[PDB]
Design a protein around this ligand. Sequence first.
Ligand SMILES: CCN1CCC2(CC2)[C@@H](Oc2ccc3c(c2)CN([C@H]2CCC(=O)NC2=O)C3=O)C1
Ligand SMILES: [Zn+2]
Ligand SMILES: [Zn+2]
Lengths: 338, 26, 801
Amino acid sequence: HDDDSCQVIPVLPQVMMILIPGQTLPLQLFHPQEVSMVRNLIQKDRTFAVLAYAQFGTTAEIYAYREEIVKVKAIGRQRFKVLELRTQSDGIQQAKVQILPECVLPSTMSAVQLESLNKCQIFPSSYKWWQKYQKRKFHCANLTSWPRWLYSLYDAETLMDRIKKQLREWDENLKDDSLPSNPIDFSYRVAACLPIDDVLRIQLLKIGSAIQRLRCELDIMNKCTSLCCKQCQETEITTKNEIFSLSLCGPMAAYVNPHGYVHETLTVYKACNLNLIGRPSTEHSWFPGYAWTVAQCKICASHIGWKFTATKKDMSPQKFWGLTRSALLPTIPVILCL
Amino acid sequence: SLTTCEVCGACFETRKGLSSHARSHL
Amino acid sequence: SYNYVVTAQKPTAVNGCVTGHFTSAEDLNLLIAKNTRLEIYVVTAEGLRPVKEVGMYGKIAVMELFRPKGESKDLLFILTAKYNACILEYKQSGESIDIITRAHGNVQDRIGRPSETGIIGIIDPECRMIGLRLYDGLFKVIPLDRDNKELKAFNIRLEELHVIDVKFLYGCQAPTICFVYQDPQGRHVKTYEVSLREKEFNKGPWKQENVEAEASMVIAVPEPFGGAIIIGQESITYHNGDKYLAIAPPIIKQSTIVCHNRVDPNGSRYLLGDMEGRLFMLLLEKEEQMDGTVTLKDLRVELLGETSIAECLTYLDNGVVFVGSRLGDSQLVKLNVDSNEQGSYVVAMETFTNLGPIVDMCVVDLERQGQGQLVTCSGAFKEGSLRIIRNLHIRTVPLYESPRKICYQEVSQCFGVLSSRIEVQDTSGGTTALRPSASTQALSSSVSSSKLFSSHETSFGEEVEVHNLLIIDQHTFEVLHAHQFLQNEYALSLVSCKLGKDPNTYFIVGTAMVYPEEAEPKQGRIVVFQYSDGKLQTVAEKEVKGAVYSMVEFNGKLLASINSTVRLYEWTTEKELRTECNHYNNIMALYLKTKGDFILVGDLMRSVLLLAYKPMEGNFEEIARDFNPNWMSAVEILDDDNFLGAENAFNLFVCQKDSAATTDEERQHLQEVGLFHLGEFVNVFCHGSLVMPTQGSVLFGTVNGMIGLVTSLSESWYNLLLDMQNRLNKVIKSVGKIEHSFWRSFHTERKTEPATGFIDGDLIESFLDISRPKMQEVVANLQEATADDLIKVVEELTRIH
Ligand SMILES: CCN1CCC2(CC2)[C@@H](Oc2ccc3c(c2)CN([C@H]2CCC(=O)NC2=O)C3=O)C1
Ligand SMILES: [Zn+2]
Ligand SMILES: [Zn+2]
């Protein structure tokens, strides 16, 4: 579309969600009113509107359409602000939408670049390397009223490595396509893969620039080092340090239960103040080798996740915990900055 | 069967136990 | 509101300098480029004769002379940053001298990634074509074979998408470019031939598939040898078909080569300059073979001397070299036959004032006359200085280190300057300074003694900055005291104010502790100094938990920003700082301004946040905010409702509080009420005037040493001037035939919107310099009003500066 267009887009009715650009939502449309829309959509723009509930949301574009009922799969693309809402008789809802802004900015030193220096800006393809990176990319900081290290705090490529390095303390694993190269894309991945609650998510989606959004996500990863029960708010479950990745998968992948319920499940070494419900089992144990025991807040008995315990004696770790993103609330043991 | 949670997979002795659990999800 | 901008000081930094035959075939000219301005001299055996200095509606990015088939004297190709391309010719009706645009057009491409190494513009040795490398992957070709009055071009595709530097080669049958590019496997040099017939590339004469990792300069050797010299960090290599001569001069591995000029038309002596003012000569040792041919025996490099940090170099004649500088003054230097006591063949034989970069400034009435002089932190490194500018006359105080912030303490008749010095880790186990300078040679010195903080495998050669507070006398401009701050401490804010019921006037310095490991600054210091018996003593230090980015006296208190917190401070009876209130924002408080009880906060990204200190309550209350993300460099309060700022790229802008107090959402938001492409990069905004219908006076310095005034206008006035502007734009002739409105249009990297709420006083004032016939034409039919009454109105305006 256009970064600040006013477009109209149909709303998947009962669907309710925060959709981060670049997330896929699987949908099964059976009510007849709905399947009609999907039909029109897929013949036309193939994009509907996922609302935040609230005057915000994301557009979702369809990349998979199978009629059995209509079964679809959409990717999130653009964030918007609701302007109007036609709740037509059919039961579907049309929406006047303002596309929120993805400001893309040049390098900080682009304007202050000394012509003579322009033929050194291409660099030839580790602490020392990034020390030189900053000494060379921001050399022309001497022409301004600010120092080099300040400009690094707004330099997309630095911000991103800063984020990678932390994310690696959670998953000694990949470092290549593992994460995107476009600040915008990378910014959006981080948001959907941090252990944050929907409000934090909504903040990042309301941020206008990929640079401001990376700075934010960094602030989240540096200040909200404690994860509490979202429901009673008075129970610290686990701390940033205890995050790890059981397999390549990652530290909070999405797993499916025998009933299609999905669970972004952050694996942590130790959790606290949790009561265990029942006897361990192994059915559909997402982590083959350990058994699961349901876990809940000792104060409000809200579901937090499971406790995985090793069947064998070889395996390490012997115990760990899986906590589902929707139960958790990040907390600062002070605001988040742009 | 009647006493397992569809969402987290918990199993109660009783089909009331299961409803008081269903709250804690909503 | 509505605002009026006028130039008080043209840009002084030189950004490019070519030596050719522009005024006549028999004259040696030096054309010099200063951002918007072109300067044309004649090279006499006594020195430089001025000829004509013109203004372009653009930023000069390519400036090259060339002599196509069927031309008496050279012609000038200029290409501006907004992609305006022109070809200019000289023409003097005995007394009348005009620069006529023979061709023009905007060479921009609707799509295309701007190349990282920026706009390159070359001309084929046989003037067959102009080459432009504007976008990664493409190459524009302006055929010169015929009158390309409109600069009709064509875009040859190019597969190498990161080309560093590119020049046409000499002595080859068909037009040939030689370029250094980088891909995964390294940096490589390739040629191509340019087929205009076929409007694409054909194979080239030669290639070399792995050259010096940081090769950056391609120099095309002229017809005698033919080929190209590839310059890099440590090696100076030569390539031609099968010849490959490579050297690694030890002398060049101290600093990086960024300049070159060809001295002899045959191309066996090239001047070379680095980033530390070293001036080198590279001599192509030739081999005169009997067959009649010549081979390249050896490459030698000789150190000639030291000059201003050079942006561009041209030899003139009789051993005179022009040095174009942006960090310091430009100069003429004479190269002698023998060396000197130390060994510098160089001797400075002239200099030219450059106030750029203007990092900080302040306005001050040193003579108690009601006029007002301007004192600037100017330049960097060895060129650093104070400049004193009065109505204009300029006194330069050389500092030999970088001034960063300046403030006037009238009580003690001196200036406070925060300055940095580069030193380098020494083999004795410490650090050595690179040369004497302000901190080094101040009558008295002091070194902070805090113990508030606690923090050997570095690198011999690694450089370090040493931050000092300088106390310079306002009359002798001598360095009286030099206070050296803590090791690993980076000074940021400076203030001279009396605080509380205390009668002393103090020096307040805000700092931040920086370590290469920790990205975000987690600790800092507000220090309170007082200068009295020739010595600076420390009154109180408040150790903060962040970087003090700005300090302002706030009606007797001290308003400081610590990272994202706007903190208000009071001076106690016991001479210490107490915290009244805090205000925590969601941006970093890089910029802090106050008019009365209003507070302006901004960060690097044009985030604006208007606070206010509710006096009875003793807290701050958010009045309004705006987020229009973009790089912002400077910002100032015009009045209690309007706010002025500088953003990328070289644009100014003004937003105002919604004066229309309608609803909460409206009243707590600032509307954009002014957009103007300036052309300079504003570093500091200073309320003041250099003198004594318009209301206000805000002066600004820029990186190019251009000084500006902004003044607020009256709805009636703005409209009337608006008409003048267009009225004029019909009569005043552009140099590249560039539209005033294009040039002033607000210009980001990816956006371009037309200017608003600004009057270009530079154009307005040009009315008094046009012909009284033409004057009447621009006044025709408006109340029509004569010239003579408009000649008055402008005169009032010239008086503001
Ligand atoms: C197939 C066994 N069963 C039989 C009874 C039942 C009603 C039909 C289902 O009872 C579950 C419901 C829901 C869930 C589970 C089991 C198991 N489970 C998680 C636990 C953590 C983990 O690691 N993997 C999981 O799949 C659920 O969310 C399926
Ligand atoms: Zn709880
Ligand atoms: Zn459950």
